Structure formats: C-alpha cells, structure tokens
Amino acid sequence: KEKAIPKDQRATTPYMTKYERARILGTRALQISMNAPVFVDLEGETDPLRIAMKELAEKKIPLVIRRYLPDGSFEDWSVEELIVDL
C-alpha cells in the first residue's frame, strides 16, 4: 500500500481522456446487459449503451479509475470527480 499517493499530492490531469471514457462506457454497458441494477430513471430506452451514457450524464457511475505511473505507483480518481468535456 506504499504505492498509493495521498489525495492531496495528486499531480495528474483532472480531466478524463477519451480512452477512459470509452473503457467506462464499455464496462457499464456490459454490466447493464448482464442484468445489473440501474441507478437512473430509465425512460423508454432498451439499449445498454444509451443507459450507460444517461448514467454518465448525471454522474452516477460508481467506478474508480486507477492510473499507473511509470515507476509503479498509482493514483485513484473517482468517476464522479472527473471532468468530462461535451
């Protein structure tokens, strides 16, 4: 647990890349398509990808991204606190 960086000493970008966005959407779409509970008010949609986008819009995806520094340490960022461009 020595690798983990304290929250105050986080020196990575506070925006989320396109790769992280695509990975998160894919994971959430798979979990929804495997009958996982939905955290938002579904309105007439039957596609897991669109419901994943909808959950992302209200920032309700309960996932955490771990970013690997080259030496081996890592930095943990919640999906709620990552700024997503539109």
Binding site: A11, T12, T13, P70
Partner: protein, 171 residues
C-alpha cells in the same frame, strides 16, 4: 515520452505537450515590421500629445489623461513587448512570422464581434486596469504540467512561452 524499458525519449511530447490535430498556422505580429510601425501600433502614452488615446474611444477617456499608475502599467507592458521582440528575433533568425500554434484567436475575436452586435461608432466601457490584469491572469491560468516543485514550474513556463508571446501580441 518513454519506451518499453522505461527510458525517456523526450521529457515532453513535442516540447509543448500539444495534440497534433489542435494546431493551426498563426502569425506572430511582433517579429516583422520596422521600428516606427511597431512604435505606432503598440505604444500608448498618457503624457505626450504624440501617443495619446483619442477620448472618443474610451468612455472614461477624459479623466484618465494625466494619471500616473496607468502610465507605469503601460510602460511595463511596452517593456514586455520589446523583450518579446528581441527573444522572437533570437529564435527565428530568418524573420518569418507564420508558425503553427494552438487556438485561433482571430476567429474568437470575430465571433465576439459578430455575436454581441458591437457598434464601433460608440465609446467602450473598458478599463486599462481591467484589460492588463485580465490578460495577465489568463496567462496565469494556462496549464500543461501540474507539479509543485520548481523543476515542473520551469518546464511549464518553457512550454507555454511562445503561446504567451502570441497572446500578448494580439491582446
């Protein structure tokens, strides 16, 4: 920028850390031109009749004339522009002005003029203090590297030098 073994090939990608598809050709206006044109274009003086602001341009043009702090700020700005001209002529010894850079400032200004229906026939309500402080603060709020020791600070200023030069040139 590293490889599979971890060896550093570049300490920053491209030396400024910019994407290759967010870069357009823009002209640095400080390099070229004779000294007379530069002086006429960028110098403003509140005590000499030669280089005053016409009061029909600034809403508070009447009262500002003869002030002391304002001319000190303008002098600092002009010294910065002179140093920028020297540095830019040191870098590009050929004297060329068009280089690729991020953000098309001309289109942003044109959009501001088109959206707000700005009429050039009326005085504007701006303040010299506000313009200078706003430009300096915007320079203060451009970030590519977010370290905290002095090394990263020097690296980040080195990265954003030329863009700050263009930004000072246009505003």
């Amino acid at each position: 920028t590293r490889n599979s073994l971890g060896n550093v090939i570049q300490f920053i990608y491209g030396e400024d850390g910019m994407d290759a598809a967010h870069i357009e050709k823009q002209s640095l206006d400080t390099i070229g031109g004779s000294d007379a044109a530069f002086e006429k274009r960028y110098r403003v003086d509140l005590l000499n009749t030669d280089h005053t602001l016409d009061p029909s341009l600034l809403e508070s043009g009447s009262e500002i004339l003869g002030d002391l702090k304002l001319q000190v700020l303008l002098d600092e700005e002009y010294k910065q522009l002179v140093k920028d001209r020297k540095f830019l002529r040191e870098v590009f010894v050929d004297g060329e002005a068009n280089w690729p850079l991020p953000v098309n400032i001309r289109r942003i200004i044109q959009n501001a003029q088109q959206t707000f229906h700005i009429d050039h026939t009326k005085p504007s309500d701006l303040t010299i203090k506000d313009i200078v402080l706003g430009v300096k603060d915007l320079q203060e709020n451009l970030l590519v590297l977010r370290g905290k020791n002095e090394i990263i600070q020097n690296a980040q200023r080195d990265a954003v030098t030329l863009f700050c030069c263009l930004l000072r040139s246009r505003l």
